[PDB]
Structures are given as structure tokens and as C-alpha cells.
């Protein structure tokens, strides 16, 4: 199916405590594969997935230099925004960027993106057309005008359609044993008593990959997506994910509720009851 390459970038100032902290984290689909942290003893771009051992030393040197360049340049951005927003030089501020591309099963571009935020709010973003930008406020409108006059959209478009897609294809090829695998969910249901003759039924889905999955509770073939509680799918520390969904049912009537699990690793969705 489709696959993605995403870089989560963060620059955070800290007046009086030295230079801004700069971090870059890259993912291929739901798998962390590279990282750069300016606060590390000796900041270097580092592999975060075993298959990245397939890249030679040139790659690491180049990505490390590129990261340090981006770091220094973001230091300028933080100062620039203080001017745009007329803010004090003593407060901590944050710049966030999500950059990347998505390809289909055939390796062709499905979409590209690049979005910035300042202190947790939308700042500027490249539109789906990969030709124009959308600015959230007047400060971002200044950036938009600068980028238009610099032909930034064209440069970014060349990166998204070329460089980005090409490396993603290569990463998927090199780490195919990890990235193209499917780990089937293992499910179970737990029971907890509640006051007023009510019971909490919790359906757990463990050890699966990729992260996308559907968990639902049913009663008489009807989905109770409404009175259902749950957590966002989450990483389990070993490259897999887990999730749970619960529903409150009347004591004594637990056998009428069934948990349903749908996942790429389940040729037949799972159906469980307590």
C-alpha cells in the first residue's frame, strides 16, 4: 500500500540558557529511522532503525552537516519572528515543522507537504498543489511574500517530487524486511466491576504493525462507537503498537458484547467476548 517519509523538526529558544535546542526526527511510515538532537554530547545525525546501517559514512556526514546548517538557520528564524510579533527577547518560543512526501504502492508521488507552526499555532503551509502557500496570520504573510519572490515553492516542489520520493523508495527497499512486514494483533478482554451493578469491559489489541487499526464494541450487530472509551494507538517500545477500547455494560449481560479487531495482519477480523 502507500508509504510516507516524514521529518518532525523542532527549534526551541531558551533565553539565558544558551542557544536554542534543535531537533529533527524522521519516520518512514510509523517507524522512527533517523534523529538529530543539538543537545546531545556531540550532535550527529544517527540511525534509529537497524536497516539504516546500509547507508555509508558519506550519508551520515552529509545529513549531520545539513542538520547543523538547519539548526543555525532556525536560530535566525526564532529571532526574525520576535520582530514579526513584537515579542520580548526573554521568553521561550517554539518553531515546528512537518515535512515529507507520500507514495503509492507503485512508488509514485501521492502527495507532498511542509507545514510550520509557531508556539503551537499554524503559521504557514504549502498547499496541496505544491505551488502556493497558506499563511495563518500577517506575520506568516510576510514569509509568504518572501518565499514567492525567492521561488521557494519551485525549490520545495523539486525536493518533494524528486529527492523526497527517491529516498523514500530507497529506504523502503533497504528496510523492506521491517517496513513491509505485518505483525498481527493479539487481543484479550479485561473485566472491572463498577458501582451500581455496572461493569467495564476493555478490549486490548497488542503487538501489531503497522499502526493503523480499528477496534469496535458491538451489541446485537450494532456498533457502540458512541459510549466507547479508548486511547490513541501507541508505540510499545519495540517497533510495534497497541490500543484499547472500553465500554460500560450492565452486570450479568457481558456475553452480549463483542469486541471486533480489524487490521492488515488479520485476514479475518477478530471477534472476542469476555
Amino acid at each position: 500500500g502507500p508509504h510516507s517519509l516524514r521529518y518532525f523538526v523542532t527549534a526551541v529558544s531558551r533565553p539565558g540558557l544558551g542557544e536554542p535546542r534543535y531537533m529533527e526526527v524522521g519516520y518512514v511510515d510509523d517507524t522512527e529511522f533517523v534523529r538529530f538532537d543539538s543537545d546531545a554530547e556531540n550532535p550527529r545525525y544517527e540511525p534509529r532503525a537497524r536497516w539504516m546501517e546500509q547507508e555509508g559514512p558519506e550519508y551520515w556526514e552529509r545529513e549531520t552537516q545539513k542538520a547543523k546548517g538547519n539548526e543555525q538557520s532556525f536560530r535566525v528564524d526564532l529571532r526574525t519572528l520576535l520582530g514579526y510579533y513584537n515579542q520580548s527577547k526573554g521568553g521561550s518560543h517554539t518553531i515546528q515543522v512537518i515535512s515529507g512526501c507520500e507514495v503509492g504502492s507503485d512508488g509514485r508521488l501521492l502527495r507532498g507537504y511542509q507545514q510550520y507552526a509557531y508556539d503551537g499555532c499554524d503559521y504557514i503551509a504549502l498547499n496541496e498543489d505544491l505551488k502556493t502557500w497558506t499563511a495563518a496570520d500577517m506575520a506568516a504573510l510576510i514569509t509568504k511574500h518572501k518565499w514567492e519572490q525567492a521561488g521557494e515553492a519551485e525549490r520545495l516542489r523539486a525536493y518533494l517530487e524528486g529527492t523526497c520520493v527517491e529516498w523514500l523508495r530507497r529506504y523502503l527497499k533497504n528496510g523492506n524486511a521491517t517496513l513491509l512486514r505485518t505483525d498481527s494483533p493479539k487481543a484479550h478482554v479485561t473485566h472491572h466491576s463498577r458501582p451500581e451493578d455496572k461493569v467495564t469491559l476493555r478490549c486490548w489489541a497488542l503487538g501489531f504493525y503497522p499502526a493503523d487499526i480499528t477496534l469496535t464494541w458491538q451489541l446485537n450487530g450494532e456498533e457502540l462507537i458512541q459510549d466507547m472509551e479508548l486511547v490513541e494507538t501507541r508505540p510499545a517500545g519495540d517497533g510495534t503498537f497497541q490500543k484499547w477500547a472500553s465500554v460500560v455494560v450492565p452486570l450479568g449481560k457481558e456475553q452480549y458484547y463483542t469486541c471486533h479487531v480489524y487490521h492488515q495482519g488479520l485476514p479475518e477480523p477478530l471477534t472476542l467476548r469476555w
Binding site: 521529518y7 523538526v9 529533527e24 524522521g26 550519508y59 552529509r62 545529513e63 545539513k66 542538520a67 546548517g69 538547519n70 538557520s73 532556525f74 535566525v76 528564524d77 526574525t80 519572528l81 514579526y84 518553531i95 515543522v97 515535512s99 511542509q114 510550520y116 503559521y123 504557514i124 514569509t143 518572501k146 518565499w147 525567492a150 521557494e152 525549490r155 520545495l156 525536493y159 529527492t163 523526497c164 529516498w167
Partner: peptide, 8 residues
């Protein structure tokens, strides 16, 4: 690989 970002 990451792109080289432009200034705001």
C-alpha cells in the same frame, strides 16, 4: 533525507 529549509 531532509530538505534544506528557507528563512521565515
Amino acid at each position: 533525507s531532509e530538505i534544506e529549509f528557507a528563512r521565515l
